């Protein structure tokens, strides 16, 4: 009901330079950038994202949510650029997407780590309510990674902004992975923060079991029946039942009865204090993950003068 008074910034197509592809596909392609706003003496590393008019509808929307929300755990949008491609351009978050990082780094991640972005994950959705927008694609694929230290939401591109005195989204026809999607967003198309709640818990599984797909090998179409019949993932071998009881409440047929995220904050933050109670990991107390410095931007932006480098959390408008 409020009014929505974010600024949207147009960026000038000159102050910002592309460096490296880093991914491609249908949806379009992400470039490795710095952005030098003119007459600031700042480099600003950047992920550039560049997109038919129905391609540079989606690309508006997707612009208006993430202008639209500020929080150290939502990604944040810089800004747009209005060429005949029209551009994204958001903070660079060097270390990749969660789901890529577990994988890759399985050998050293500790339960200090896993903990903390379960908590972090669970502030930023939080946020996410608290403007009362729904995610609805939710995973580990869409979370990325500042620092091993701290991650960020990201992918708003079926982002959902309630209407006033809206308690739901109903969708149509759009296509959607069900593997992450709550029963009553499978059966109905229904999607609420509580449905939101139901991915988080898939998102935890993810992480808890580095990696891995959910109903690894099972045709999508057979999801939704697997579900009605009381079926969920297992319990990850390193999952205390503690941890996993949350999982599963996150997967309640009833979605009033699933935790609310604020609540998930509280729970994995209490598990976060003695973080090898509640996750067994073979020799965690010696796992380290880098965290680096003028050094990494050098090397990371392919440039040597890195003295001017500003994070896009530091440069504030
Ligand atoms: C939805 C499909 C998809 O792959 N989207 C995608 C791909 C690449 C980057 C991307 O967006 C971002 N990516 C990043 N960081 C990042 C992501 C992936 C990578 N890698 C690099 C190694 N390899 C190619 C896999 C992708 C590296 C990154 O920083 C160096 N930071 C901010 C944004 Cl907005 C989205």
Same mark, same amino acid.
């Given at each position: 009901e409020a009014p929505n008074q974010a600024l949207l910034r147009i960026l000038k197509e000159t102050e910002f330079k592309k460096i490296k592809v880093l991914g491609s596909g249908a949806f379009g392609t992400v470039y490795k950038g710095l952005w030098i706003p003119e007459g600031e003496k700042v480099k600003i590393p950047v992920a550039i994202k560049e997109l038919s008019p129905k391609a540079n509808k989606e690309i508006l929307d997707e612009a208006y949510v993430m202008a639209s929300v500020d929080n150290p755990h939502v990604c944040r949008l810089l800004g747009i650029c209005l060429t005949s491609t029209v551009q994204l351009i958001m903070q660079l978050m060097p270390f990749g997407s969660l789901l890529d990082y577990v994988r890759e780094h399985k050998d050293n991640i500790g339960s200090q780590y896993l903990l903390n972005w379960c908590v972090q994950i669970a502030k930023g959705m939080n946020y996410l309510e608290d403007r009362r927008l729904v995610h609805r694609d939710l995973a580990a694929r869409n979370v990325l990674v500042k620092t091993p230290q701290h991650v960020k939401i990201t992918?708003?591109?079926?982002?959902?902004?309630?209407?006033?005195?809206?308690a739901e989204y109903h969708a149509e026809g759009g296509k959607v992975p069900?593997?992450?999607?709550?029963l009553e967003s499978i059966l109905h198309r229904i999607y609420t923060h509580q449905s939101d709640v139901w991915s988080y818990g898939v998102t935890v599984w993810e992480l808890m079991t580095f990696g891995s797909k959910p109903y690894?090998?099972?045709p999508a179409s057979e999801i939704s029946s697997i579900l009605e019949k009381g079926e969920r993932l297992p319990q990850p071998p390193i999952c205390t039942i503690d941890v996993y009881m949350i999982m599963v409440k996150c997967w309640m047929? *009833?979605? $009033?009865?699933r935790p609310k995220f604020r609540e998930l904050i509280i729970e994995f933050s209490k598990m976060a204090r003695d973080p090898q109670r509640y996750l067994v990991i073979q020799g965690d107390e010696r796992m380290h993950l880098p965290s680096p410095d003028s050094n990494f931007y050098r090397a990371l932006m392919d440039e040597? *003068?890195? $003295?001017?480098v500003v994070d896009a959390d530091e440069y504030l408008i």
């Open positions: 992918d708003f591109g079926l982002a959902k902004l309630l209407g006033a005195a809206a069900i593997k992450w999607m709550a690894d090998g099972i047929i *009833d979605a $009033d009865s040597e *003068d890195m $003295d001017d």
